[PDB]
Amino acid sequence: MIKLYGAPQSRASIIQWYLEELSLPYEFVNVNLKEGEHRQAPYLAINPFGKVPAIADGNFHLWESGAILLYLAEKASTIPADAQARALVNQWILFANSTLANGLFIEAVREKEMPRLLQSLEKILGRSPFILGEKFSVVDVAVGSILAYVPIMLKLNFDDYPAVAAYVQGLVQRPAFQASIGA
Amino acid sequence: MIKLYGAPQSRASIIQWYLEELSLPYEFVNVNLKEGEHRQAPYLAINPFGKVPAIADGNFHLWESGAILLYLAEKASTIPADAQARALVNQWILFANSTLANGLFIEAVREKEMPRLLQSLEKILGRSPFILGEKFSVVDVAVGSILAYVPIMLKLNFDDYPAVAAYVQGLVQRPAFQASIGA
Ligand SMILES: N[C@@H](CCC(=O)N[C@@H](CS)C(=O)NCC(=O)O)C(=O)O
Ligand SMILES: N[C@@H](CCC(=O)N[C@@H](CS)C(=O)NCC(=O)O)C(=O)O
């Protein structure tokens, strides 16, 4: 089965949320970051940059939370996808991992970037329940996890963005979220 | 041909580098960021977050430099790839856009992150000429572009990382790099 390498209150929880959504079994392997386990040869053979999360699926190893989400989404897919359908999913995962996370969590750029990001998301989320339309997808795990960390880590709220606020509330109340990030 | 939306001294040059490596033509369209053209309705209809680069491939539009690189790499592949082969490339593109760029360019984390990132890259690059092995790939465009920007923006060098220094020197001398980032 999939082995997920993670640590307490790390991005491995985002992978656990998607595994809960997909109803897939997995082994959780704790990596003791406080004691430097991630900086030793055994973990560096899984991720040479010593970061969690990572997965092992047999002899295959993979790191970067965004690449793990895309991999799990592809493996679970029932209808074959083309380069354009994968590209739109990749776009949102890259956005969550760079443009969005940076604009919200980098103090030097937050005042300018955060309102613009949320204003753009408000327009999108006001027209459809999920980022890609009527159906929940891996994009909502990627983008939604970053947004859900705003109240948790910055003590900020989405009161000025009602569609964003309702979207994040809807994700937080999903049983799969409550069994992972929300636990 | 692909339309590439870019701006002076921006990440659109990374896409232009890869298009030149693939010997593909493209129609370059400047977006005047200094005059707020990226915040006007025509550009917001391409990228709702008002960032360059973006591409149009016929009626298909795509934003996030990393997603564009993955899309062009998929489109230019002659041998069909499975989820694991795509995942390894996705891993490096996410790394370049998050872990690597943040660890090098965010002042508050640079002291701890930068030597760790460079030491890991030094070990990989000391064993093979390119990140994935013997052959140059889209991963070298993604990672190499970020590393090439280190001397320019931070006034730092790779004197203590000789394989990183020789790898970057090699990339900067490539004709496709000179026709794009080096132009
Ligand atoms: N872009 C990476 C970031 C991973 C990351 O920063 N992981 C942290 C924990 S949340 C880590 O392993 N830190 C250990 C260290 O930097 O020494 C991803 O999304 O997977
Ligand atoms: N993660 C994005 C970042 C894109 C980005 O930051 N682009 C800048 C280039 S200057 C931009 O368009 N800035 C305009 C703005 O932020 O208003 C990518 O890699 O494409």
Author numbering:
A (entry chain B), B (entry chain A): 1 to 183
Paper text:
Glutathione transferases (GSTs) constitute a widespread superfamily of enzymes notably involved in detoxification processes and/or in specialized metabolism. In the cyanobacterium Synechocsytis sp. The crystal structure of SynGSTC1 in complex with glutathione adopted the canonical GST fold with a very open active site because the α4 and α5 helices were exceptionally short.
In this study, the crystal structure of the glutathione transferase chi1 from Synechocystis sp. PCC 6803 (SynGSTC1) in complex with GSH is presented. SynGSTC1 crystallized in space group P43212 with two polypeptide chains in the asymmetric unit. They formed a two-fold dimer that had a globular shape with molecular dimensions of approximately 55 Å× 55 Å × 45 Å. The SynGSTC1 protomer adopted the conserved GST fold that was subdivided into two domains for clarity (N-terminal domain β1α1β2α2β3β4α3 and C-terminal domain α4α5α6α7α8). This “missing” region made the active site of SynGSTC1 very open, with no clear pocket for the hydrophobic substrate (H-site). The active site contained GSH tightly bound to the G-site by numerous polar interactions (respectively, six, two and three for the γ-Glu, Cys and Gly moieties). The GSH Cys moiety adopted two rotamers (m, χ1 = −52° and t, χ1 = 172°) exposing the GSH thiol group towards the solvent. The crystal structure did not reveal a strong polar interaction between the sulfur atom of GSH and the enzyme. The Y5 residue, recently proposed as a catalytic residue, was far too distant to stabilize the GSH-thiolate group during catalysis as the Y5 hydroxyl group was 17 Å away from the GSH sulfur-atom.
